[PDB]
From Swiss-Prot, chain A:
Protein location: Virion; Host cytoplasm
Full protein: residues contained: 689 to 835 of 1132
Gene: J
Domain Fibronectin type-III: 24-119
Top-level taxon in the UniProt lineage: Viruses
Lineage, highest ranks first: Viruses, Duplodnaviria, Heunggongvirae, Uroviricota, Caudoviricetes
Assembly information from the UniProt record: Interacts with host LamB.
Protein name: Tip attachment protein J
Similarity annotation: Belongs to the Caudoviricetes tip attachment protein J family.
Length: 147, 49, 49
């Protein structure tokens, strides 16, 4: 709350005028978008009320946990940014991967948000690259024994 | 990789690191499970097999 | 170094009090973290403090 008073030459106080209000910036994420790709998941969160002072920090996990308080001691910190790319080599397509995203600003933090993502589900978007290519050299002993 | 730290005040020293690329086997190529066809084939193999 | 003094009604200087200190931004990277992958290297260097 803020109180304002008007004073005359000697500073005799007048009748005060007070205004009260709160300040905070939880900024809980409204939604999360995941774009699959070659051993990668492009993660981008969005929130209802835009605010040019908020980043998002992400935590990666492979198995979902039943507790939301031990997240700091259960998952691993990966980064605080506006977007992230979860490009790795140990990850495999078809497996479920859990992202815990929370907003961070100068004031404080927000509530955790859980998202589930996978890689590309095979399909045909990653195939039209070897039309007439892949000659004998890329094969091994199986080609020689079967030819 | 030569990495240094910068800020408003100034700069830092240089740190040297060496990096390579992954050389995974079998599992990296598990994406291509029985998807190649006659179109994705060498000419000599096609005319021989 | 910062020197502070207290002055009375007319502004007669008192006994000075001086405190000296320095500021810098070394930020020397404590260690390097790199991740190889498919034709790519993910560089996420860290630092001590």
């Amino acid at each position: 709350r803020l109180t304002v008073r008007a004073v005359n030459a000697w500073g005799q106080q007048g009748d005060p005028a007070s205004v009260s209000f709160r300040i905070a910036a939880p900024a809980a994420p409204s939604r999360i978008e995941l774009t699959p790709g070659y051993f990668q998941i492009t993660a981008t969160p969005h929130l209802a009320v835009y605010d040019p002072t908020v980043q998002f920090e992400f935590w990666f996990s492979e198995k979902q946990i039943a507790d939301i308080r031990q997240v700091e001691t259960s998952t691993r910190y990966l980064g605080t940014a506006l977007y992230w790319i979860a490009a790795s080599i140990n990850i495999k397509p078809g497996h479920d991967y859990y992202f815990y995203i929370r907003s961070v600003n100068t004031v404080g933090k927000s509530a955790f948000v859980e998202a589930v993502g996978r890689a590309s589900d095979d399909a045909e978007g990653y195939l039209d690259f070897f039309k007439g290519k892949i000659t004998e050299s890329h094969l091994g002993k199986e080609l020689l024994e079967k030819v």
